[PDB]
Amino acid sequence: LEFTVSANTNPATDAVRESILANPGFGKYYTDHMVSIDYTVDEGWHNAQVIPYGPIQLDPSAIVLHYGQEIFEGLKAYRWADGSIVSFRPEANAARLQSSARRLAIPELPEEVFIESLRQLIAVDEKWVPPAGGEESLYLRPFVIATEPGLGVRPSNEYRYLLIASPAGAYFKGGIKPVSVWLSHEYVRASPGGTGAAKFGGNYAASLLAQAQAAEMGCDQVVWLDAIERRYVEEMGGMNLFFVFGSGGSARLVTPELSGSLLPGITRDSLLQLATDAGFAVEERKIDVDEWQKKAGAGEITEVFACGTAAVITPVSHVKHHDGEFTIADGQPGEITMALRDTLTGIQRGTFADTHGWMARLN
Amino acid sequence: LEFTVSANTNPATDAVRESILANPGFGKYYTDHMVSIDYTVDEGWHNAQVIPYGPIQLDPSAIVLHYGQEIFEGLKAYRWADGSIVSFRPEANAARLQSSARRLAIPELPEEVFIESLRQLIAVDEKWVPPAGGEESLYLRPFVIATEPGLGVRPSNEYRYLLIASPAGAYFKGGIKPVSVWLSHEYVRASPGGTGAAKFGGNYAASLLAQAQAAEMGCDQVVWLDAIERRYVEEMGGMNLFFVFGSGGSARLVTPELSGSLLPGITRDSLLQLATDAGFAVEERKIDVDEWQKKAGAGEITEVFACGTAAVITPVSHVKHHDGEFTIADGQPGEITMALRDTLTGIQRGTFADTHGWMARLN
Ligand SMILES: *Cc1c(COP(=O)(O)O)cnc(C)c1O
Ligand SMILES: *Cc1c(COP(=O)(O)O)cnc(C)c1O
Numbered sequence: 108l109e110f111t112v113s114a115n116t117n118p119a120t121d122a123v124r125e126s127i128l129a130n131p132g133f134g135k136y137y138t139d140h141m142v143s144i145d146y147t148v149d150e151g152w153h154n155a156q157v158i159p160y161g162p163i164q165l166d167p168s169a170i171v172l173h174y175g176q177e178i179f180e181g182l183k184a185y186r187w188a189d190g191s192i193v194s195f196r197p198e199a200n201a202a203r204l205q206s207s208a209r210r211l212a213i214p215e216l217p218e219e220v221f222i223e224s225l226r227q228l229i230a231v232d233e234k235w236v237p238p239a240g241g242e243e244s245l246y247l248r249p250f251v252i253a254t255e256p257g258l259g260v261r262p263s264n265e266y267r268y269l270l271i272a273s274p275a276g277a278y279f280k281g282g283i284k285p286v287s288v289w290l291s292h293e294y295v296r297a298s299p300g301g302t303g304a305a306k307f308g309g310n311y312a313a314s315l316l317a318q319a320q321a322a323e324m325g326c327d328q329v330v331w332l333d334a335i336e337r338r339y340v341e342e343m344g345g346m347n348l349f350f351v352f353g354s355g356g357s358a359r360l361v362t363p364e365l366s367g368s369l370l371p372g373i374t375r376d377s378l379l380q381l382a383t384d385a386g387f388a389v390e391e392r393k394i395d396v397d398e399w400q401k402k403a404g405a406g407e408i409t410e411v412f413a414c415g416t417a418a419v420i421t422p423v424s425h426v427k428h429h430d431g432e433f434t435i436a437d438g439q440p441g442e443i444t445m446a447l448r449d450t451l452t453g454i455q456r457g458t459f460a461d462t463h464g465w466m467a468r469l470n
Numbered sequence: 471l472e473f474t475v476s477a478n479t480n481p482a483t484d485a486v487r488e489s490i491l492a493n494p495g496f497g498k499y500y501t502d503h504m505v506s507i508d509y510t511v512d513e514g515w516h517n518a519q520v521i522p523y524g525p526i527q528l529d530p531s532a533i534v535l536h537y538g539q540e541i542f543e544g545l546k547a548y549r550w551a552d553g554s555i556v557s558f559r560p561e562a563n564a565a566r567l568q569s570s571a572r573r574l575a576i577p578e579l580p581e582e583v584f585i586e587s588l589r590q591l592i593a594v595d596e597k598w599v600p601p602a603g604g605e606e607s608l609y610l611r612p613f614v615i616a617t618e619p620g621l622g623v624r625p626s627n628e629y630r631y632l633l634i635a636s637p638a639g640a641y642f643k644g645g646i647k648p649v650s651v652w653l654s655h656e657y658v659r660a661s662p663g664g665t666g667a668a669k670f671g672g673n674y675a676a677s678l679l680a681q682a683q684a685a686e687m688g689c690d691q692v693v694w695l696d697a698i699e700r701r702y703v704e705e706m707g708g709m710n711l712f713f714v715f716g717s718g719g720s721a722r723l724v725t726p727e728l729s730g731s732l733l734p735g736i737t738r739d740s741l742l743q744l745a746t747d748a749g750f751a752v753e754e755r756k757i758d759v760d761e762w763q764k765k766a767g768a769g770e771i772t773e774v775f776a777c778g779t780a781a782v783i784t785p786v787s788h789v790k791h792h793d794g795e796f797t798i799a800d801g802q803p804g805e806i807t808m809a810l811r812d813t814l815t816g817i818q819r820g821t822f823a824d825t826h827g828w829m830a831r832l833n
Contacts, residue, residue, distance in 0.1 A: 133621070161530075167634050177538060250536060258497025273531075302675075307676075312670070
């Protein structure tokens with residue numbers, strides 16, 4: 108697929124850009140350009156191009172505005188010491204976007220086109236990638252929306268793929284700070300036969316009240332329990348969870364299994380591998396509130412943390428739920444939690460060896 | 471709220487508008503204008519206006535395009551013999567949009583403003599309302615979308631309410647026709663506590679695969695079973711269901727109760743009342759597949775029909791599911807099914823007495 112480039116004539120000044128890169132926050136500012144690719148049944152994906160970041164046009168009856176047919180992804184681009192610009196496992200995101208697409212009846216975007224859109228945007232907006240050897244990065248947000256007009260309920264026949272970038276600092280206010288969680292007694296993030304395994308906007312809109320309630324109960328984030336038995340721990344907001352049993356090199360990690368409604372996080376998959384590389388025993392099984400509170404209080408469960416592209420790893424220190432409340436260890440980020448975070452971020456920044464070939468060059 | 475009007479300087483010629491009204495189909499064509507109301511935290515709902523139907527603009531990071539925070543409604547405008555333009559229970563739609571808004575963390579729109587937008591649009595696009603004495607109408611689609619830019623996950627602080635209209639000709643052009651249904655064994659429409667009771671786009675995008683599967687099994691529409699026991703019948707696509715036991719004046723009606731996950735259909739609410747007015751005994755309870763097939767085969771269940779705004783009432787004649795297949799009576803639309811459809815549409819068209827005061831003037 109051939110991309111055409113229409114340069115932004117009035118991009119952010121070097122001063123404004125530098126200012127942003129110094130204090131970017133998350134998903135607040137956007138680069139000067141974006142990638143756009145159209146889709147029609149007859150031409151498939153076409154009219155791929157790099158254009159200036161700006162307002163999009165949609166018919167009032169566009170399917171995405173009524174029946175929420177949309178999906179998204181989230182990955183990062185990093186600037187290395189040698190001046191190269193790389194991304195962490197972009198092939199995985201390409202593949203998951205196709206998985207989310209299938210579950211939502213949206214045409215798949217070829218992985219080579221996905222990866223190419225990334226290279227094209229960085230080619231024009233490389234100066235928006237943060238300096239090497241830092242916590243900052245450039246968040247890439249690939250997404251697809253149904254654009255065909257018509258109020259009839261059915262899969263759209265026209266779509267638009269968009270790629271925008273946003274300098275990223277720290278998703279959670281604090282970063283090196285553990286969060287408290289409220290286990291939702293009233294809400295579920297998904298159920299068997301649902302869209303829990305797809306990175307689909309609908310999933311997030313549905314969770315807003317549950318998060319609001321977590322905050323009203325005096326907690327930072329909501330944690331999801333299975334929709335069937337209302338007993339098994341799944342995720343924290345839109346992040347996977349890990350439980351650390353014991354400590355030192357003999358410690359073991361437990362994380363909820365991919366039941367079918369759980370979203371297969373790439374950070375999760377990576378951490379399981381890194382844990383094994385380190386020598387820790389890992390296990391993907393079901394774990395319920397009862398065992399959690401019991402072993403945490405007992406001291407067997409020494410740490411708990413959430414993981415995801417945006418925050419990478421976030422320590423969990425306190426738990427509150429319909430039938431109890433307890434703290435994890437001393438309420439501070441655990442040894443293992445931080446050891447794994449330093450290793451993962453180290454690989455992403457080019458500091459540590461990438462033995463699994465996870466880093467790919469974008470430039 | 472005061473509405474400002476910006477007339478369409480390029481409206482559809484009389485030739486085009488007339489050709490559309492002669493064969494409008496459904497949700498295919500739109501009138502010359504649309505209503506728009508903006509929402510910000512400091513100004514609340516404001517800048518209410520009637521403007522030309524046309525493409526709207528959104529920032530690429532608009533929340534609705536990433537985390538599906540949106541909701542909608544569906545009602546109709548009818549032209550009566552006396553020349554008036556009326557609507558069926560529009561106050562109920564206003565109330566439901568508020569209910570959907572609350573579940574999706576979206577600011578509620580005052581019922582007074584909702585009704586006003588309806589009056590305002592009809593004021594300029596009255597010519598698009600079909601002739602009286604027929605079964606055609608003007609479908610009204612009110613909806614709210616989150617427009618604030620920002621990739622962080624949280625309720626939007628900026629919204630836009632839009633009201634568009636689409637002519638809708640006779641649903642059943644050549645005589646009413648019954649549909650076949652596939653009871654979904656693999657998918658669920660919603661889970662307890664979820665967003666099943668809200669008119670939210672996400673619910674529909676998630677159902678696309680299940681409908682495609684129903685068709686692949688050789689059926690017209692997909693029917694939903696409860697997410698818990700996977701045995702209790704809920705709805706057909708985006709329409710409620712009714713079961714007719716027996717026949718004649720002593721017939722009895724049974725419909726799934728509002729378990730909390732079912733969508734409180736307005737057509738459904740109306741039919742339960744009309745059934746009572748005719749002297750039919752009614753029941754709002756759970757009914758499983760076993761009872762359905764068993765009693766349908768024994769001839770106790772004589773009819774089944776689905777209901778909703780667009781089609782009003784659609785007969786269901788054939789059922790197929792994981793463990794069986796059966797037909798309802800003679801496979802034709804039942805007596806009670808058509809009697810009730812004739813009564814309801816008669817009230818909407820102004821032919822029968824509106825004893826409950828459901829019809830409201832829009833003009
Ligand atoms: C995106 C997402 C994650 C994390 O996936 P990463 O690939 O690690 O970024 C976890 N859970 C849900 C529900 C998600 O949508
Ligand atoms: C809109 C809708 C209905 C029908 O409601 P009416 O008010 O009768 O138009 C039924 N089920 C679902 C899931 C819906 O979204």
